[PDB]
Amino acid sequence: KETAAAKFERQAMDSSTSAASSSNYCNQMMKSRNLTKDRCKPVNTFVHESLADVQAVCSQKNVACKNGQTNCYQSYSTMSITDCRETGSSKYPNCAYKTTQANKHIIVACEGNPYVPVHFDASV
Ligand SMILES: [Cl-]
Ligand SMILES: [Cl-]
């Protein structure tokens, strides 16, 4: 299996672009990251920052996770992100997504050693 850390990297990181400059970004990335393989993953967020900057969030503001756990951290600054969400008329395997580009603080759950992000809790 994929480790938790690697799975986060694959689903969330997109350091190759500064921001989504197309309405087709999500359709293309969701497919390329293999997120539409067995089904259409309904929601996903990609972060357009360096991996090092994202990992560093694990040393930032400690806050509660939506589930109540306390291993969540909120980034001190805003980051470039792209929210990908399935449209109402999307059907596997013809997955279709709405692309929404924004600048928001990210909140992630961190774990392990090294202590890195394992799940994307939300953005503010
Ligand atoms: Cl790993
Ligand atoms: Cl994969």
From Swiss-Prot:
Membrane-spanning parts: none
Disulfide bond residue pairs: 26-84, 40-95, 58-110, 65-72
Superkingdom of the source species: Eukaryota
Primary localization class, coarse: secreted
Reaction(s) catalysed (UniProt annotation): an [RNA] containing cytidine + H2O = an [RNA]-3'-cytidine-3'-phosphate + a 5'-hydroxy-ribonucleotide-3'-[RNA]; an [RNA] containing uridine + H2O = an [RNA]-3'-uridine-3'-phosphate + a 5'-hydroxy-ribonucleotide-3'-[RNA]
Residues involved in substrate binding: 7, 10, 41-45, 66, 85
Tissue-specificity statement: Pancreas.
Glycosylated residues (UniProt): 1, 7, 34, 37, 41
Residue ranges the record marks as coiled coil: none
EC number(s) given by UniProt: 4.6.1.18
Record keywords: Disulfide bond, Endonuclease, Glycation, Glycoprotein, Hydrolase, Lyase, Nuclease, Secreted, Signal
Cellular compartments annotated: Secreted
Active site: residue positions: 12, 119
MF terms in GO: lyase activity; nucleic acid binding; ribonuclease A activity; RNA nuclease activity
GO biological process, one term: defense response to Gram-positive bacterium
GO cellular component terms, A-Z: extracellular region
The protein's assembly and partners: Interacts with and forms tight 1:1 complexes with RNH1. Dimerization of two such complexes may occur. Interaction with RNH1 inhibits this protein. Monomer.
Function per UniProt: Endonuclease that catalyzes the cleavage of RNA on the 3' side of pyrimidine nucleotides. Acts on single-stranded and double-stranded RNA.
Entry's family note: Belongs to the pancreatic ribonuclease family.
Name of this protein: Ribonuclease pancreatic
Naturally occurring in which organism (per UniProt): Bos taurus
First-to-last residue of the parent protein present: 27 to 150 of 150
